[PDB]
CSV table of C-alpha atoms and ligand atoms in Angstrom, one decimal:
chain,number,residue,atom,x,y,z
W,56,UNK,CA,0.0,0.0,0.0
W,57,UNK,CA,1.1,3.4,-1.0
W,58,UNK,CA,-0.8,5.6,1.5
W,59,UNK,CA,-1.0,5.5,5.1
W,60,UNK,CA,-3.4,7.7,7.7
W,61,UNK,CA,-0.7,10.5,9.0
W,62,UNK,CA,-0.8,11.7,12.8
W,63,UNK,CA,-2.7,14.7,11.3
W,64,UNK,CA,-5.1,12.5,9.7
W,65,UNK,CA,-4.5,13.2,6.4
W,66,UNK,CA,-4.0,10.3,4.4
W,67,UNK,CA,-0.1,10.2,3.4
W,68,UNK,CA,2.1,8.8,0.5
W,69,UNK,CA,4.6,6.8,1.7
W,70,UNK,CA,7.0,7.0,-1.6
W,71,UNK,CA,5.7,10.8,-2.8
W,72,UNK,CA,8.4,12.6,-1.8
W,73,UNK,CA,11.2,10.3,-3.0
W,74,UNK,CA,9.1,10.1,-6.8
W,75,UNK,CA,8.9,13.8,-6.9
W,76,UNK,CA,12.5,13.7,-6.2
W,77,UNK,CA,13.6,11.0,-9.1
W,78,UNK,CA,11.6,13.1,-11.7
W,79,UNK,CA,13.3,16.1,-10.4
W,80,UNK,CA,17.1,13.8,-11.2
W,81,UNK,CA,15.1,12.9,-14.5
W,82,UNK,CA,14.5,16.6,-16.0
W,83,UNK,CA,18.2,17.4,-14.6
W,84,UNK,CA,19.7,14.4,-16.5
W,85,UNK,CA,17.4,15.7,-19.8
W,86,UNK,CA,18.3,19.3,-19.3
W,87,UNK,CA,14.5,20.3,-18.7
W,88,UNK,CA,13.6,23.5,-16.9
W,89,UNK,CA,17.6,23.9,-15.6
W,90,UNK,CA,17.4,27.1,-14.8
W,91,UNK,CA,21.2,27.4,-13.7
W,92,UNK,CA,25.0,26.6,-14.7
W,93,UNK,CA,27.2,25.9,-11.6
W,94,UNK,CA,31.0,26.5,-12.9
W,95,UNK,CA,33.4,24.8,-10.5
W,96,UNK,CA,36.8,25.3,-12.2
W,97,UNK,CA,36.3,24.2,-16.0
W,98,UNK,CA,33.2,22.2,-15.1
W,99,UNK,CA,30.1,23.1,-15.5
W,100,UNK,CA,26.5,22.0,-13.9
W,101,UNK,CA,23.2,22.3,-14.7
W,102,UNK,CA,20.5,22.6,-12.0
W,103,UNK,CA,17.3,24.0,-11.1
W,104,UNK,CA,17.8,26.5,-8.3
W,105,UNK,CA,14.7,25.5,-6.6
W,106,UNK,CA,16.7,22.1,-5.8
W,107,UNK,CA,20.0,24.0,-5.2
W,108,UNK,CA,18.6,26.0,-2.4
W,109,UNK,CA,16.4,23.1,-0.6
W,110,UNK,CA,19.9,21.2,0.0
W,111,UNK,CA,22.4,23.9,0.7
W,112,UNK,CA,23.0,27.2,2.8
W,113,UNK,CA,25.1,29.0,0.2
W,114,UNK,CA,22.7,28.1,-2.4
W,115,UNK,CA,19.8,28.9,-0.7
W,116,UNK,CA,22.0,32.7,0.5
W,117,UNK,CA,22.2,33.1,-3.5
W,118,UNK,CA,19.1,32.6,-4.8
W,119,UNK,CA,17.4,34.7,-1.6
W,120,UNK,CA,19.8,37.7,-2.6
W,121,UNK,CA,17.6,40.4,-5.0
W,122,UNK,CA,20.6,40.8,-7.0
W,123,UNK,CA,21.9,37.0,-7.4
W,124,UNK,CA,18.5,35.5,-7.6
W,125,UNK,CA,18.9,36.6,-11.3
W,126,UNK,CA,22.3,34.9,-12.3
W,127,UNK,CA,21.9,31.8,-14.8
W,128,UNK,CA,25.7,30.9,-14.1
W,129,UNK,CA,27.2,30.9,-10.6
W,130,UNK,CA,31.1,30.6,-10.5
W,131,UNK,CA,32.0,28.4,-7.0
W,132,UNK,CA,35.4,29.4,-5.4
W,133,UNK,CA,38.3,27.3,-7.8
W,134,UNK,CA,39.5,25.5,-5.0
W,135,UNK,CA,36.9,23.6,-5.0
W,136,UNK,CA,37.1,20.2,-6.7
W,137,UNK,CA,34.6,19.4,-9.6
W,138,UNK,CA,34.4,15.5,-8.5
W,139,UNK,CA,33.3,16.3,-4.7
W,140,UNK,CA,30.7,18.8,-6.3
W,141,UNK,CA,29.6,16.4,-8.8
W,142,UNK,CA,28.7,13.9,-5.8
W,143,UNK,CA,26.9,17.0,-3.5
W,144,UNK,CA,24.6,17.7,-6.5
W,145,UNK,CA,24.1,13.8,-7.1
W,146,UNK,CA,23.2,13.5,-3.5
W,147,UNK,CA,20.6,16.6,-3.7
W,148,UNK,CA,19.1,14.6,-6.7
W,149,UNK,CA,19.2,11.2,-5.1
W,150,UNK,CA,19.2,11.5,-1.5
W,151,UNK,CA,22.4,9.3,-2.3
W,152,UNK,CA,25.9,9.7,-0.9
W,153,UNK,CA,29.1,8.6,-2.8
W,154,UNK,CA,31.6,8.5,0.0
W,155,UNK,CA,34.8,6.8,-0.6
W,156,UNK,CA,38.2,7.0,0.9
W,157,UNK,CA,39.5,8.7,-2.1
W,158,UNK,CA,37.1,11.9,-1.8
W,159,UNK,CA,35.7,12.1,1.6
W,160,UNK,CA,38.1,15.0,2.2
W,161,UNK,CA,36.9,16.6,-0.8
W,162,UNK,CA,33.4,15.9,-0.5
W,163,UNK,CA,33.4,17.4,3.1
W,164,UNK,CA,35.5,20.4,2.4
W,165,UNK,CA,32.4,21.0,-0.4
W,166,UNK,CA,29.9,20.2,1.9
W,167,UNK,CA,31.2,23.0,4.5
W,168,UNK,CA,31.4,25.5,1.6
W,169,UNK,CA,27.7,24.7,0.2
W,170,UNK,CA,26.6,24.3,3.8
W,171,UNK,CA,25.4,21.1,3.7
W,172,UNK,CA,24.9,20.2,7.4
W,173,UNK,CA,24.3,17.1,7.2
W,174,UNK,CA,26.5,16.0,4.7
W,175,UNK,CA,29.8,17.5,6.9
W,176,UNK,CA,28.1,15.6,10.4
W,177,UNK,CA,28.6,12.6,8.1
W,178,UNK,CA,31.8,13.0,6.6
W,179,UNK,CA,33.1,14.1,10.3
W,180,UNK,CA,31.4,11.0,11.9
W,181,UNK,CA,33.3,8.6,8.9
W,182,UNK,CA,36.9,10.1,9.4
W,183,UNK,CA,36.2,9.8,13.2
W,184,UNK,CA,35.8,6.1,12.3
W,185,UNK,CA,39.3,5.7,11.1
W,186,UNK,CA,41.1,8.4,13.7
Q,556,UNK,CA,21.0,8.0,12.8
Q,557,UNK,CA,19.6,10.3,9.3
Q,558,UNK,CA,21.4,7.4,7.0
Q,559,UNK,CA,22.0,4.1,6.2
Q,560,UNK,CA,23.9,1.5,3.6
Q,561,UNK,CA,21.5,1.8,0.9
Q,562,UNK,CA,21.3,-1.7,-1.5
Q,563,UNK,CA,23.9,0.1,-4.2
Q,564,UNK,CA,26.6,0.1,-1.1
Q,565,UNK,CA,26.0,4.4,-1.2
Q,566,UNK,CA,25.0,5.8,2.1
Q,567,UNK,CA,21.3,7.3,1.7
Q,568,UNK,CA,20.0,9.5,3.7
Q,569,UNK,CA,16.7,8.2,5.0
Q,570,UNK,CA,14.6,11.9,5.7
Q,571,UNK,CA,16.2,13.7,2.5
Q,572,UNK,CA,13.6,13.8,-0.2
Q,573,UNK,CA,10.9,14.9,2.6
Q,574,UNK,CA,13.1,17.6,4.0
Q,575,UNK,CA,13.7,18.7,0.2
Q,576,UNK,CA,10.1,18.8,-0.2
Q,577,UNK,CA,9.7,20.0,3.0
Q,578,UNK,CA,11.7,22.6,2.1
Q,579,UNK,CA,10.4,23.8,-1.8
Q,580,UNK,CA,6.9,23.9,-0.1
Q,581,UNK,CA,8.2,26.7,2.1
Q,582,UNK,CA,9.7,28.3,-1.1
Q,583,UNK,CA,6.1,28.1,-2.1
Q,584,UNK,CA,4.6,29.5,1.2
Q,585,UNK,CA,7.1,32.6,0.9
Q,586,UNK,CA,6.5,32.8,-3.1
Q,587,UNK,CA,10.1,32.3,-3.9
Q,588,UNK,CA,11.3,31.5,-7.1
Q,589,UNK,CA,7.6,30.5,-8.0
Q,590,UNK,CA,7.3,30.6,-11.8
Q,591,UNK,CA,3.9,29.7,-13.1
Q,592,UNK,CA,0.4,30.9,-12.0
Q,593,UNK,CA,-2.5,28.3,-12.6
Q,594,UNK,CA,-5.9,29.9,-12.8
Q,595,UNK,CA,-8.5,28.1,-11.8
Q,596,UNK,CA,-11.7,29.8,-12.4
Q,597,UNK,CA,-11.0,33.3,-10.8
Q,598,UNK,CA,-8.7,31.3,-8.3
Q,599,UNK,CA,-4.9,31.7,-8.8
Q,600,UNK,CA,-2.1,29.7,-7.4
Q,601,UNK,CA,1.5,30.0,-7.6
Q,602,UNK,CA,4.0,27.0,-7.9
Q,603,UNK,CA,7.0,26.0,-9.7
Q,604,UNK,CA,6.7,24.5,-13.2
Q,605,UNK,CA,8.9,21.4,-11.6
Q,606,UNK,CA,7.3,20.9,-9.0
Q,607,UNK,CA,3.9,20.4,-10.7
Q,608,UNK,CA,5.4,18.3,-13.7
Q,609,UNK,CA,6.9,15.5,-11.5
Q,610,UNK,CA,3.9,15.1,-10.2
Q,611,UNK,CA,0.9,15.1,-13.4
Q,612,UNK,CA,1.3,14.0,-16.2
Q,613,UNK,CA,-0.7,17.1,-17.4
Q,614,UNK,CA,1.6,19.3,-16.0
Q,615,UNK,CA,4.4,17.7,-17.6
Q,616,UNK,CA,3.2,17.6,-21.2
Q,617,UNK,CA,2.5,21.0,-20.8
Q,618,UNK,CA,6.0,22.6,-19.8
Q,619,UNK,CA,8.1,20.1,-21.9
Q,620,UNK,CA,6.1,21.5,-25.1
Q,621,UNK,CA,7.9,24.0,-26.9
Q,622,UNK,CA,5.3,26.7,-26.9
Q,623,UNK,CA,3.9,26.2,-23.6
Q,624,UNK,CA,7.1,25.9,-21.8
Q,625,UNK,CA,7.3,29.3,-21.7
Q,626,UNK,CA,3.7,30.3,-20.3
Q,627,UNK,CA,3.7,32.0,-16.6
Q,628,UNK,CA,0.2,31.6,-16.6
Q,629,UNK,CA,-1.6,28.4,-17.1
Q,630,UNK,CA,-5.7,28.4,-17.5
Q,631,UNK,CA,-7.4,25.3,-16.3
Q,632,UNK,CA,-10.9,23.8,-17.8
Q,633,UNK,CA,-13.2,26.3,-16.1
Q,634,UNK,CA,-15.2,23.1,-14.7
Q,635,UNK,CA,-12.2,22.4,-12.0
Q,636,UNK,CA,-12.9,22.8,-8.8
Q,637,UNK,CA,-10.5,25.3,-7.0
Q,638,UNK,CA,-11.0,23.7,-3.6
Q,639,UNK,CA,-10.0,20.1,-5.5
Q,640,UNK,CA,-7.1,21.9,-7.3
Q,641,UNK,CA,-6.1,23.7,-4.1
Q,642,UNK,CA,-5.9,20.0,-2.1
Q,643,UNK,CA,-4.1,18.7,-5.0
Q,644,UNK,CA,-1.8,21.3,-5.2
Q,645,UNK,CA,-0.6,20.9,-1.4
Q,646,UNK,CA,-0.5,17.0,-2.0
Q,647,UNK,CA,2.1,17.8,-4.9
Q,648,UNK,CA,4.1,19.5,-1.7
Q,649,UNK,CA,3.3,17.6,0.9
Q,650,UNK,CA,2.5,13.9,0.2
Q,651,UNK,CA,-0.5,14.6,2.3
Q,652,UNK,CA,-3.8,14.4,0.6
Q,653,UNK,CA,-6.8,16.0,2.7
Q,654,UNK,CA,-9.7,13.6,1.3
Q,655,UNK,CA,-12.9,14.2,3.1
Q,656,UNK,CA,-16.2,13.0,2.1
Q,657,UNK,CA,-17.4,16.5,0.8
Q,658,UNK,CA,-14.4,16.7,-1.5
Q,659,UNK,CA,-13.3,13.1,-2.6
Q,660,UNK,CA,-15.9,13.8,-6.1
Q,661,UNK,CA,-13.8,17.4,-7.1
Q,662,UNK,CA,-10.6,15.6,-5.8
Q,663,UNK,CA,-11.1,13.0,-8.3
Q,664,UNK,CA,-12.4,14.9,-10.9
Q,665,UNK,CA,-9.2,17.1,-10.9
Q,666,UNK,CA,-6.8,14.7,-10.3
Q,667,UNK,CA,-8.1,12.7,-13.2
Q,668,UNK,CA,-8.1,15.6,-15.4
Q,669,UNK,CA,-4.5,16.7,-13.9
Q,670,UNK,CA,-3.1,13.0,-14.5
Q,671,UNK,CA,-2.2,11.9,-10.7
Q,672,UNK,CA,-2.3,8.2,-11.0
Q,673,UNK,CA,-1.9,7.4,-7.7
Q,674,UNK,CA,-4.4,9.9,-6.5
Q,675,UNK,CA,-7.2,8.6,-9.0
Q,676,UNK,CA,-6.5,5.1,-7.5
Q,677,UNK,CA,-6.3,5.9,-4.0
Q,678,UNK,CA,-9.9,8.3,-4.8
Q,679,UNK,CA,-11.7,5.2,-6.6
Q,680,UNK,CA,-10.5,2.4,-3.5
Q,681,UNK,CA,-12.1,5.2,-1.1
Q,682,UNK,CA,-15.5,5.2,-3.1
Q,683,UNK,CA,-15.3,1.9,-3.2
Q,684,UNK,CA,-15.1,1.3,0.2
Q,685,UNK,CA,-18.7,2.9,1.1
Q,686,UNK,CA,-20.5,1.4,-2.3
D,1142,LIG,C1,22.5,24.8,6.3
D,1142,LIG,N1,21.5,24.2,5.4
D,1142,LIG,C2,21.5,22.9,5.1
D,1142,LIG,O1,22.2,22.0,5.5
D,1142,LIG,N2,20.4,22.7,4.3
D,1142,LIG,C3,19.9,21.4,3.8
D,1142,LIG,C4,18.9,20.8,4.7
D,1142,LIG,C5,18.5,19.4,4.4
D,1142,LIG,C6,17.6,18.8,5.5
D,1142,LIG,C7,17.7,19.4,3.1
D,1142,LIG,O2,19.7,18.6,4.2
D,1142,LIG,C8,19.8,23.9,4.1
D,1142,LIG,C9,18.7,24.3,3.3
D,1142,LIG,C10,18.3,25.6,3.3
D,1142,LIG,N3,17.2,26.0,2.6
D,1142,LIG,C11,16.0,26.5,3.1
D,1142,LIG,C12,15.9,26.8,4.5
D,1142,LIG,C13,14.8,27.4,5.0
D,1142,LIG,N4,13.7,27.7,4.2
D,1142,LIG,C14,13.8,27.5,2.9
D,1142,LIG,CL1,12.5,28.1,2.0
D,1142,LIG,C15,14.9,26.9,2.3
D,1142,LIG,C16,14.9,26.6,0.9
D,1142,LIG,N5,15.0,26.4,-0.2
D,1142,LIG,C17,19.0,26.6,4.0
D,1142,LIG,C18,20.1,26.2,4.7
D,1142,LIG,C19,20.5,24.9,4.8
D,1143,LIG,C1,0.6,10.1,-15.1
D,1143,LIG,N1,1.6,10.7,-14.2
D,1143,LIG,C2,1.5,10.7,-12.8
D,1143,LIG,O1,0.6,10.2,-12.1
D,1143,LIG,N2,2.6,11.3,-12.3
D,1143,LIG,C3,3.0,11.4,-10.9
D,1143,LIG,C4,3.9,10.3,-10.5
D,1143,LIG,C5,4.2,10.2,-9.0
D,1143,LIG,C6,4.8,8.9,-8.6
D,1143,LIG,C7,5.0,11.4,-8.6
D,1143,LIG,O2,2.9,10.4,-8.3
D,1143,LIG,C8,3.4,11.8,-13.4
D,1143,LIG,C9,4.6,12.4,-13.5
D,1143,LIG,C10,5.1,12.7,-14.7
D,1143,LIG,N3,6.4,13.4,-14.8
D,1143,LIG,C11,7.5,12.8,-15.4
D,1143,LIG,C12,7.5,11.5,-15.9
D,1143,LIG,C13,8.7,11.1,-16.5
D,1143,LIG,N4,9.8,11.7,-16.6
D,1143,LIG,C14,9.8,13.0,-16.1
D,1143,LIG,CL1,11.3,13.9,-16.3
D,1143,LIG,C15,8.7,13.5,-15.4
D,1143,LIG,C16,8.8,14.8,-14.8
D,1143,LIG,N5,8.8,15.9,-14.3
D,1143,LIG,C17,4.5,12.3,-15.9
D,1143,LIG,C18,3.3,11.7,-15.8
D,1143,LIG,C19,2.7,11.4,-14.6
């Protein structure tokens, strides 16, 4: 069953907000409706900045701002590395992390700059590990 | 703990799509970045194009045509039911649906007419139930 009778009695959809969430990942991956290019060094993203701003601080600080809200192409600083902001904007599509070894120190250092809470808790809570 | 070893071996975070949700209704709420009005018989409502297109297949044959992509306002059939679209369009938010006996008819009616699958479905079990 797909629905369930939430505390507010309203009936709720189990899976709703995940589905709205894999056809936002599908117009991203078909360039519908990106209303944004994020250039990180050579790279460059597409995004819709509706998405940008419900996963990160910075993004959200942009995209408030009466003058930035505006911008179709946001440069990041150039220290930051394209593959660790290529896995942040997967995870705000996916709700999936790609943390390995080999970027976790990228991936955090990212995460702090986007301010993406919970994303630096984790990466602090899996270098603890080690440690 | 907000994640877990998802069945791909990437760590997912469990709460993510309903805090992103969570968090474009509030864009909503504050009319930020909202970029479509749908009129529904003198009855306006603001929401984002991507918002409404992951969820109704309407919706979403509407902004990926190439005229209509570029609409900011989108008329409804004049027989839709603002309360029914209004329910609908916090569902699309949400994931709650507020199906009451004196609504469940314009409920289904819109959603129908809108494309929501799963809200037809769930609409039809409920009338089914009584009968
Ligand atoms: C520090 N920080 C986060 O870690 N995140 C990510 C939250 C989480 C749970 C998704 O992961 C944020 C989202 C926002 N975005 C909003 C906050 C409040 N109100 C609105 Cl309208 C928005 C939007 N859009 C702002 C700051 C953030
Ligand atoms: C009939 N119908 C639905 O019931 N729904 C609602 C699905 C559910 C599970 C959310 O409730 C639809 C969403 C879409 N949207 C997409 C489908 C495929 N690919 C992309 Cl990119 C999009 C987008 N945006 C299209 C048709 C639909």
């Amino acid at each position: 069953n797909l629905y369930f009778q939430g505390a507010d009695s309203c009936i709720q959809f189990t899976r709703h907000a995940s589905d709205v969430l894999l056809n936002l990942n599908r117009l991203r991956s078909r360039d519908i409706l990106t209303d944004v290019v994020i250039v990180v060094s050579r790279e460059q993203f597409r995004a819709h900045k509706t998405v940008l701003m419900a996963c990160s601080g910075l993004f959200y600080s942009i995209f408030t701002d009466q003058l930035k809200c505006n911008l179709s192409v946001i440069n990041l600083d150039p220290e930051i590395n394209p593959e660790g902001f290529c896995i942040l904007l997967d995870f705000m599509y996916t709700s999936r992390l790609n943390l390995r070894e080999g970027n976790i120190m990228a991936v955090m250092a990212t995460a702090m700059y986007l301010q993406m809470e919970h994303v630096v808790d984790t990466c602090r809570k899996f270098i603890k590990a080690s440690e």
